[PDB]
Amino acid sequence: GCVLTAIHLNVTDLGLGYETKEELIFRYCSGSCDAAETTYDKILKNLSKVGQACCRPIAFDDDLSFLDDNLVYHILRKHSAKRCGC
Amino acid sequence: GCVLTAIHLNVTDLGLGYETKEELIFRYCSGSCDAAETTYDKILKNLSKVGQACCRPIAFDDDLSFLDDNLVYHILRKHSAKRCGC
Amino acid sequence: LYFSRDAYWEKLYVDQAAGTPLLYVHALRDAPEEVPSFRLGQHLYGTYRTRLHENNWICIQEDTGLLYLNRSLDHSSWEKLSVRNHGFPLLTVYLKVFLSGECQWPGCARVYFSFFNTSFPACSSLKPRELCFPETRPSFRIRENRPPGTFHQFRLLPVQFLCPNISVAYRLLGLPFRCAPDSLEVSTRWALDREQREKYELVAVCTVHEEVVMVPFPVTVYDEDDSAPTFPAGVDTASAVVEFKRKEDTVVATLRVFDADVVPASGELVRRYTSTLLPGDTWAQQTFRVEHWPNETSVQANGSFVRATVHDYRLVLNRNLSISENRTMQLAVLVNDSVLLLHFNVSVLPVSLHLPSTYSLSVSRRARRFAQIGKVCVENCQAFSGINVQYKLHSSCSTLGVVTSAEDTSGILFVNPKCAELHYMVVATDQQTSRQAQAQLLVTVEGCPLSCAVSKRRLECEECGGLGSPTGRCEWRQGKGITRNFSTCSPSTKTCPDGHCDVVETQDINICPQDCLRGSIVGGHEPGEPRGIKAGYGTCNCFPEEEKCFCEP
Amino acid sequence: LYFSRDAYWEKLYVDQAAGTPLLYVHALRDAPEEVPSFRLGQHLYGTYRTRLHENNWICIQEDTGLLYLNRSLDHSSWEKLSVRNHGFPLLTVYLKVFLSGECQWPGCARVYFSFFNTSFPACSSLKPRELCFPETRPSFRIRENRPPGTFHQFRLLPVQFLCPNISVAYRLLGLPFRCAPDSLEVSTRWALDREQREKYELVAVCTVHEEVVMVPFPVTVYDEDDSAPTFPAGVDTASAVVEFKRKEDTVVATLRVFDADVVPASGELVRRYTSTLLPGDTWAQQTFRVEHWPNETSVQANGSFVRATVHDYRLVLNRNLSISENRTMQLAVLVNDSVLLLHFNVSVLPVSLHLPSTYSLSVSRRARRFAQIGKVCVENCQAFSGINVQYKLHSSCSTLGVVTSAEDTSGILFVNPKCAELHYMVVATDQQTSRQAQAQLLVTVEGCPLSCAVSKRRLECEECGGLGSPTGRCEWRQGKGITRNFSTCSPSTKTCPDGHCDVVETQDINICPQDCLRGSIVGGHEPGEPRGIKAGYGTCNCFPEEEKCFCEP
Amino acid sequence: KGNNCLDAAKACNLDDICKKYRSAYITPCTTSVSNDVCNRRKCHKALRQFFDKVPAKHSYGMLFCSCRDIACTERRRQTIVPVCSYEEREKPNCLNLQDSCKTNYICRSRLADFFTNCQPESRSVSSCLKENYADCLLAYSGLIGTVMTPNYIDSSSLSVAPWCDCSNSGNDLEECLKFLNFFKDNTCLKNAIQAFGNGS
Amino acid sequence: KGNNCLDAAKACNLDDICKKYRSAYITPCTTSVSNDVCNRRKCHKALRQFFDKVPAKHSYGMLFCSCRDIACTERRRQTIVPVCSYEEREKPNCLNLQDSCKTNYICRSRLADFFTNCQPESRSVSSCLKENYADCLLAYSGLIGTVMTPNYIDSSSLSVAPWCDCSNSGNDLEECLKFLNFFKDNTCLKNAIQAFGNGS
Ligand SMILES: [Ca+2]
Ligand SMILES: [Ca+2]
Ligand SMILES: [Ca+2]
Ligand SMILES: [Ca+2]
Ligand SMILES: [Ca+2]
Ligand SMILES: [Ca+2]
Ligand SMILES: [Ca+2]
Ligand SMILES: [Ca+2]
């Protein structure tokens, strides 16, 4: 279902506008769930383009930070995950 | 966003196959969210027909149960909601 | 001395005279010596048995049991009482009549009075419907086999006492009931018995002046222990041979006894109908018992459906017998009724433990753990009930394994390097007797999720195997709404999607969950009565590590 | 008596003779009476100052300060020591030279020796580059204004002691430095002063046999307190009038003093350059102080860039002065240097509290609470610094309200039934002096989320109003990457999306959050240095009840 | 058109308190356990807490919905599930059911109430007092959930009965019927049912 | 092609422990507070815990990435943020910086280590012992994060310096330069930098 997957990326590939080239190792949660799992969702499917369950994290990791070109450090809190859930 | 809405229905309109006509008051969660709300979802939108956030509940209510025609009671657990979230 | 009825009805009005007769009473006789004495009560009991005031207005004749006013009735008396009436509308007070606390038959009979706001109405305002009998009908109650006598008198005493100029006549319709002319006492000629007839709803004929009136007349006839136990037309004793079951309890032999009474009712039936076991060997007290429960039935005897009891006696086992018992006895039973003789030929035969020795079977080597292959069965398969025949597998390469299922005491064998023929000397033991046997197996060998229930589609079940497979793969069963024919990718197509949860399926909680999970299925379901599915909607697939299944199309 | 240098270098070899001279030493004179005595140390100190063994091989002449071997050097001695060398390669040991602990100039001078595995090399294996001077160059250190003398001697003593058949000559290049013929002592004729020249990097000329060699020769000249404080060409005393600020501290007047020395360095500058405040009224000690910090500069005096100190003296306020002070004094300062006279004309003038009395303004009646409309200003707007001029609003209908902002001490007025003209007698008070004033306001009146920052688009901000609106609606400001020009639906287009968080914006936490929230913005951001935004990517909208904003395109 | 019973069900289940304690009396009555069909004890406990806590106009509607066709009378009898809660394998004798109620506290409370309340005496107007109807009502519907459970038999009328008969009675038979038809043919209780089913 | 510094950054940030305590020395150095530009004290504390906990081959790579073009030498100087952590408004005198290090425990540890380690004595082979390089390394990079912070000045060479000069010195000037150029022109430390930047 909602499972863990590590990846390599650039902070330029985060694309927040920070002027650097430095990188990171990023761990995300992917894969859909069972799409009903209670009576209430069955009745939501009966009543209705907004809909069923999602994949999210259940906690967050420690920080990720770096230097840009222009003389300045940049910080990131709440950016990548450890454990995944519906 | 994902908000609360009460409704009147029949248990026949639940359509689980129970042989009755008795009813209920059902409270659901409707309305989509802000569709990005993190860098990770921006990069998911960059990479990709499966997609962005949903509307779900955050808890469940107390039980809902009844009688059918044929001499038999029927129970329901986990069927309707109190509070709604992305 | 008992009362022919229980409750008496008569009406009062304002300013009636003293000495104005109300009613006669009647008391029957169980013996000719029985002289009915009569006396009154004291307090006018009101609605919801409220004592109201000392009755000083009324006297009685013991000799006839005649009620008559000594004092007269007036609005000072009837508003003195209607305040005590607790704010309720007044139309009923009553008294007690003892003849030799709470008033009941046969010691007592309560007599009512229904007062009205008006006084005594005139003779022309009285319709002939209410000149013959009062409205609330009597209920006559006679015991059988008594000194026969008189139980009823006709005349409305205020009516003829204050309107005597109307000629009023009363009579009755091979019946012992007769009405005398010139004296309106109702009598019975000879004594009744229930065992011939038991219901007499006759008609009393009234004649006014002109109108003739017909009224009901119910008589209930009682019963006695004038009967001893009796066989049902030449059936004295049955017998059978204790053969196969040997459970802790099983009904063996059954006899019927006809006592023609009803009278020892279902409460004091413990005290009289005792199944006295006549002794013998004390081993029968270890191993047998006599159960006795009645049921009462009706029969035509002289045109009425007279009822009585049927007393059945049963021999039920008392313990789980061993195999090797070979004995015989004759067990006698005395029967009380307040005394018949019964017996039973009871013989115990032992059972041979001869398992079929030579039998062979082929096993696909691709099979997974807990794989159902073959049935080991003793010579009497569907017949043992209280014997623990346990299967031991001595071997002479570990692939197979047997545990006896406690249902059939039969063996469903399971899976617990160039070795494609083996030798399993199957040893068939017992626990309560050390007697075992053994037999020869000549087993011939012929060369994705964890469980099967996680599967969802047809080819998803057929192209992939689970944990308990004797074939390597699982098997899809496929069959209205909330019904026992549901569908699942089940392992054991005669044992998994089945309705029984055996010891093949319950060792580790992955094998066959539809019949053996303890979760909570979401869906249009109906819970399996041990556990699991009794019914489920659409498709039903399971995720057992979360201990949960789902029914959803 | 001080040493012309600090560290001395000479080489040793195996089996050199006793009485073999190593080096002369030199010690300068601060007085002509100063007789340099010389004695040696005791332990051969090794690498990382490790005592190795008692030096018994070497004696000295105090009179010339000549080092020479009393005993000879052999492999029994140099493997006795190289084990004590802690497993490190041996090329450097040293001693101490006291002249009248840790060895330092001018009490001591440490002398090195660089031993080699070979013995003394022959005369033809010595290139004329290493016959003149050793490799590690000397560093000559002379104090100015001394009895001038001799500080250096040329001859390599093992070279001529064991290869005397090579004619070797040494000389030097209006300089007091001279080299005598037939005696190779280097002398200085007259005494030096730093204040004329301070750097002498000359060249000593060596002649072998044929090769002539040129070498460096650095001399550092020191300094004294031969100088008293001095004015910078006719600048004695400044003055100013204490006018507007009246902060706790502000520099008022500034003077420059030139003492031509360097010698009282930055450590003991507290002990000598004391700003002695000459007394007067004690009110100046309540209200003023004299700060003194140096900075050292260089100047051309006779072709070199001779450096000295610059001593500035400043008058800085000591407390928040009141308004009504009207006085004058002449504050004198004595200056020490180990003594100059300074003063300051200091006059305090009071400030009038004449607010402009008659002023009118129009207010749209649709405006919301905390609505910025107009500026109240005292007669000297951008000029007060340490005076708490607080605004009180006496009225004679509650729509408007004023609180003084503590930045400008100016009034930004806010919103806290057929009444469309009012009268607000604006009362301008102070806290430290009871002096107030008052003035006349003739205010003329002319007939969706909670905050503005929750808005997201252009017309979404322009077609809907928030909490702090003077116009009823909000206002969209719209302006690269992580930059201070960001965009928001801000209330106060000169005060909300601004960079300052005033008391207009901070009463209840809904008004202008971009400059005043305390949250944590997600996005390419750069935090506002008090709080809030300094920069944010794309579009930035806020949700203040969760105390959070977002920057996202 | 439906009937009065489904509309009374709409009346109960729309209030969430009636619905929640409805599920309270539902749950142990229909989870079948090993070698039973339900638990009788928990089910009856939960019916008693339903007919004590939740107020009148929801429950007495569904219990006393006036009927005009036959499936109404079915559901009229259905009101407490005979199959788990009222029926058993056997009917005992009615005095046995009376003393087994007499070994129960709350049962004897409801039975003394019913002796008190729906009594058909001499000639008042509708065989009752017409304002002790509710006490009549809180008698019968009071009797629900203890061991003496009344329920309908005659779908075509309003004659209720418990789970016994006057078999095996002997001498007390008529007294049995004096008890038994007291549930079966009461003019006062039938007037109360008709009055509550007309809309009183 | 990049340079050695971005690849050494790839070397550090791929290990998550180097990255986590990287963010530890990042965070208080660049959240600007009211009337400062950062906190110097928390920032230097966090640099010290970074250069104590995380092992060698990540950090000394980025700090000692050998340079061939000018933005490399920029980032070479950039290694500890002068603007918040090394630069201030003023340079004091170097003996003042020495005694202010002498009022600091860990600083004096690193300074006595650097006195011990990268010493350019008489003629060994590469002005060092070549296997006390790491002790040379754990001297200089040891000195990071206390009040005596060395950093680069000459981008075109390897001459490092702290935040002082020999102004206001008077008599101790040359001794000052004896100290000062000890950071600036060390043959042993420059041989160690070249050796670590060739891949030792
Ligand atoms: Ca008889
Ligand atoms: Ca008899
Ligand atoms: Ca008998
Ligand atoms: Ca099964
Ligand atoms: Ca001088
Ligand atoms: Ca001087
Ligand atoms: Ca001086
Ligand atoms: Ca602002």
| H or E segment to which residue C271 belongs | helix C269-272
Largest CA distance in chain C: 124
C-alpha span between D18 and D32 (Å, rounded): 35
User: Counting ligands in written order, which one lies closest to the CA of residue D193?
Assistant: 5
Phi-psi group of A63: left, alpha or beta (phi > 0 → left; psi -120 to 50 → alpha; rest → beta): beta
Q: Ligand 2: distance of its center to the CA of F78 in Å?
A: 122
Q: Tell which of C101, C122, C143 closes a domain.
A: C122
Cβ burial E97-109 (10 Å sphere, 16+ → b, else e)? bbeebeebebbee
Contact call for residues D391 and D398 (beta carbons, < 8 A) = no
Is residue A15 within 8 Å of residue B42, measured between CB atoms?
yes
Asked whether residue D380 falls in the same domain as residue D391, the answer is yes
In DSSP terms, D363 is beta-bridged to D445
Give me the domain span that covers residue B81.
1-86
- Can you give the length of chain D in residues? 553
Pairs from D277-286 (Cβ < 8 Å, separation ≥ 24): D277/D331, D277/D332, D277/D333, D278/D331, D278/D332, D278/D333, D278/D334, D280/D329, D280/D330, D280/D331, D280/D332, D281/D329, D283/D327, D284/D329, D284/D331, D284/D346, D285/D318, D286/D318, D286/D319
Structure tokens at D421: 């003209």
Beta strands in D352-436 (DSSP E): 358-363, 375-376, 389-395, 400-405, 410-415, 424-430
Instruction: Write out the H or E segment, with its range, that includes residue F9.
Output: helix F4-14
Cα–Cα dist A38/C445, whole Å: 47
Residue A39 C-alpha, separation from nearest chain C C-alpha, in angstroms? 7
Q: Which pair of tokens denotes residue D533?
A: 């935004």
Contact D227, D251 (CB under 8 A): no
B31 contacts B85 by C-beta, under 8 angstroms: no
Locate breaks in chain A with C to N over 2.5 A; list the residue preceding each: 48
Long-range contacts of range C400-406, CB-CB < 8 Å, 24 or more positions apart?
Answer: C400/C363, C400/C373, C400/C424, C400/C443, C402/C376, C402/C426, C403/C503, C403/C504, C405/C502, C405/C503, C405/C504, C406/C503
Which of chain B's residues have a Cβ under 8 Å away from the Cβ of E31? Answer: 75
The first and second tokens of residue D453, run together, are 């920052």
Task: Give me A15's structure tokens.
Answer: 């694309």
What is the C-alpha R_g of chain D? 40
For chain D, the residues before each gap (C–N > 2.5 Å) are 100, 173, 209, 338, 396, 416, 447, 479
Q: What sign for the dihedral angle of Cα D506, D507, D510, D511? A: negative
Cα–Cα distance between C508 and D395 in angstroms, integer? 87
Who's near C348: CB < 8 A, 6+ residues apart? C241, C242, C321, C325, C326, C327, C328
- Is residue D430 within 8 Å of D386, Cβ to Cβ? no
Question: What are the distances in angstroms from CA D503 to CA D46, D409, E134?
Answer: 70, 12, 68
Pick from C506, C471, C477: which is nearest to C490 by CA?
C477
Q: Do chains E and F touch (3 or more CB pairs under 8 A)?
A: no
Centre of ligand 2 to C-alpha C262, Å, is: 8
Do D296 and D266 form a contact (C-beta atoms < 8 A)? no
Token match 């008496």: residue? Answer: C8
d(CA D149, CA D170): 18
| Gap between the Cα atoms of E47 and E30, Å rounded | 13
Element (H, E) at C289: strand C288-300
C226 annotated as ligand-binding: yes
The C-alpha atoms of residue D519 and residue A77 are separated, in whole angstroms, by 13
Q: How far apart are CA F135 and CA F118, in angstroms?
A: 8
CB C155 within 8 A of CB C184: yes
Pairwise CA distance, residues E192 & E186, whole Å: 10
Q: Report the b/e string of C376-412 with b at 16+ CB within 10 A.
A: bebeeeeebebbebbbebeeeeebbbbbbbeebbbbb
Pair type for strands C239-242 and C340-348: parallel
A43 touches chain C (CB under 8 A): no
Q: Do chains A and F touch (3 or more CB pairs under 8 A)?
A: yes
User: What span, in angstroms and rounded, lies between the C-alpha atoms of C283 and C275?
Assistant: 18
**One domain, residues D410 and D439:** yes
Mark whether D48 and D90 lie in a shared domain. yes
Q: What would the DSSP string read from start to end of D86-133?
A: TS-----EE---B------TTTB-EEEEEEEEEEPPPGGG--THHHHS
Burial of C15 (0-12, 13-18, 19+ CB in 10 A): exposed
Within 10 A of D3 (CB to CB), how many other CB atoms are there?
22
CATH number at residue B43: 2.10.90.10
Please tell me what DSSP assigns to residue C16.
Answer: P
- Contact across the interface for B79 and A28, Cβ inside 8 Å: no
Resolution (A): 4.4
Question: Is residue F14 classed as helix, strand or coil in its secondary structure?
Answer: helix
Give residues preceding each break in chain C, C–N over 2.5 A.
100, 173, 209, 338, 396, 416, 447, 479
d(CA D290, CA D310): 16
- Is any Cβ of chain E less than 8 angstroms from the Cβ of B6? no
CA count, 13 A, side-chain hemisphere, C109:
25
Q: Is B78 on the interface with A (CB under 8 A)?
A: yes
Q: Determine how many CB atoms are found less than 10 A away from the CB of residue F56.
A: 12
Distances (CA, A) of D527 to B7, C61, D497, D514: 46, 116, 14, 11
Cα atoms in the Cβ-side hemisphere of radius 13 Å centred on C37: 3
Task: Name chain A's partners: 3 or more CB pairs within 8 A.
Answer: B, C, D, F
User: After which residues are there C–N gaps above 2.5 Å in chain B?
Assistant: 48
- Radius of gyration of chain F from its Cα atoms, rounded to whole angstroms: 17
Count of other CB atoms within 10 angstroms of residue F42: 14
State which H helix or E strand residue F26 sits in.
helix F16-26
Determine which of D485, D522, D533 to mutate to test the interface with A (most A C-beta atoms within 10 Å). D522
Minimal-distance CA residue of chain B relative to C482:
B17
Counting beta carbons within 10 angstroms of the beta carbon of residue E47, is it exposed (0 to 12), middle (13 to 18) or buried (19 or more)? Answer: buried
If one counts the domains in chain E, the total is 1
Residue C496 and residue C513 in contact, taking contact as beta carbons nearer than 8 Å: no
CA F36-F38-F43 angle, 5° bins? 145
Q: Give phi and psi for C42, each to the nearest 5.
A: -120, -50
Helix ranges, D257-387 (H): 269-272, 283-287
DSSP reduced 3-state for F67: coil
Distance from C-alpha of C538 to C-alpha of F148, rounded to nearest angstrom: 76
* Beta pairing class for C66-69 and C93-94: unpaired
Two tokens, residue C65: 């049991």
- Measured in angstroms, how far is the CA atom of residue D515 from the centroid of ligand 8? 5
Q: Which residues contact F50 (CB under 8 A, 6 or more apart)?
A: F21, F22, F24, F25, F59, F145
Secondary structure of D34-82 in the HEC alphabet? CCCCCCCCCEEECCCCCEEEECCCEEEECCCCEEEECCCCCHHHHHHHH
Chain mean position to CA E181: 15
Which alpha helices (H) appear in D404-517, and where do they start and end? 458-462
What's C93's DSSP letter? E
Tell me the residue range of the domain where F62 lies: 4-198
Residue B77 CA, distance from chain mean position:
13
Per the CB < 8 A criterion, the answer to whether C345 and C315 are in contact is no
- Which of D206, D226, D246 finishes a domain? D226
- Beta strand A73-74 with A66-67 is antiparallel
C-alpha span between C406 and C411 (Å, rounded): 9
Residue where the block lists tokens 């090769």: D211
Residues D341 and D363 both lie in one domain: no
Pairwise CA distance, residues A40 & D39, whole Å: 102
Same domain, C389 and C285: no
Backbone CA torsion sign across C64, C45, C98, C136: positive
D340-348 and D288-300 strand pairing? unpaired
Type and span of the H or E element at A9: strand A3-10
Could you tell me which chains touch chain E, where touching means 3 or more CB pairs under 8 A? B, C
Q: How far apart are the first and last CA of chain E?
A: 22
DSSP H stretches of helix in D247-406: 269-272, 283-287
Report the candidate in F150, F138, F168 with the shortest Cα–Cα distance to residue F101: F150
Q: What residue has token string 């033991």? A: C429
The answer to whether D229 and D339 have CB atoms below 8 angstroms apart is: yes
- Tell me how many domains chain D contains: 5
Question: Which chains touch C (3+ CB pairs under 8 A)?
Answer: A, B, E
Cα(D224)–Cα(E197) distance, integer angstroms = 124
Task: Say whether residue F27 is in contact with chain D using an 8 A CB cutoff.
Answer: no
The CA dihedral of D432, D436, D439, D441, to the nearest 10 degrees, is 50
Query: What is the amino acid identity at position C351?
Result: V
Question: Of the candidates C416, C447, C478, which is a domain's last residue?
Answer: C447
D426 and D385, same domain (yes or no): yes
Cis status, amide bond into D36, omega within 30 of 0 = no
Of the candidates D276, D260, D393, D262, which has an alpha carbon nearest to the alpha carbon of residue D332?
Answer: D276
Name the phi and psi angles at F56, rounded to 5.
-75, -50
Check if the beta carbon of residue D69 is closer than 8 Å to that of residue D14. Answer: no
CA distances from C102 to C28, C92, D151 (A): 21, 18, 148
Question: Residue D101 burial by CB count (10 A; 0-12/13-18/19+): exposed, middle or buried?
Answer: exposed
**SS3 letters across C378-402:** CCCHHHCCCCCEEEEEEECCCCEEE
* Long-range contacts at D430-434 (CB < 8 A, ≥ 24 apart): D430/D323, D430/D353, D430/D387, D430/D388, D430/D389, D430/D390, D431/D388, D431/D390, D432/D320, D432/D322, D432/D323, D432/D387, D432/D388, D433/D322, D433/D323, D433/D324
Q: Are C487 and C476 in contact (CB under 8 A)?
A: yes
| CA C20, chain centre distance (Å) | 53
CA F130 to chain centre: 20
Token digits for F146? 């206390």
Look-up: residue for tokens 């107020």? E55
- Residues near D462 by beta carbon (within 8 Å), at least 6 away in sequence: D473, D474, D475, D476
Q: Which residues pair with C313 in a beta bridge?
A: C255, C292
How many whole angstroms separate alpha carbon D53 and alpha carbon D46? 9
Q: Are residues C76 and C139 in the same domain?
A: no
State the DSSP code for C516.
T
Residue in E122, E128, E177, E178 to test binding to C, most C beta-carbons within 10 Å: E122
Q: Exposure string (b/e) for D140-159, b if CB count within 10 Å is 16 or more?
A: bbbbbbbebbebbbbebbbb
- Whether the CA torsion C145, C146, C149, C155 is positive or negative: it is negative
* End-to-end Cα, chain B, rounded Å: 8
Q: Which of residues 295-334 of C touch E (CB under 8 A)?
A: 296
- Longest CA pairwise span in chain A (Å): 58
Tokens (6 digits) for F110: 């690193």
CB E37 within 8 A of CB E84: yes
Residues of chain E found within 8 Å of residue C527, distances taken between Cβ atoms: 31-32
Q: Among F182, F142, F176, which residue's Cα sits nearest to residue F161? A: F182
Residue with the two structure tokens 């100039």: D105
Measured distance CA(C412)–CA(C405) in Å, rounded: 7
Contact D338, D227 (CB under 8 A): no
Q: What is the dihedral of CA D38, D43, D44, D49, to 10 degrees?
A: -110
The one-letter amino acid at D85: N
Cβ contact C513:C532 at 8 Å: yes
Residue D182 burial by CB count (10 A; 0-12/13-18/19+): exposed, middle or buried?
Answer: exposed
Spatial separation of the C-alpha atoms in residues D48 and D39, rounded to whole Å? 23
Same domain for C241 and C342, yes or no, is yes
Method: cryo-EM
b or e along D60-78 (b: 16 or more beta carbons within 10 Å of the residue's beta carbon)?
beeeebbbbbeeebeeebb
CATH number, domain with residue F90: 1.10.220.110
Q: Which helix (H) or strand (E) holds D442?
A: strand D437-445
Ion ligand 1 — residues with CB under 5 Å?
C 144, 193, 195, 224, 226
Instruction: Give the range of the structural domain holding residue D127, as residue numbers without chain letter.
Output: 123-226
> D231-242 burial, b for 16+ CB within 10 Å, e for fewer?
eeeeeeebeeeb
In a shared domain, residues C546 and C513 = yes
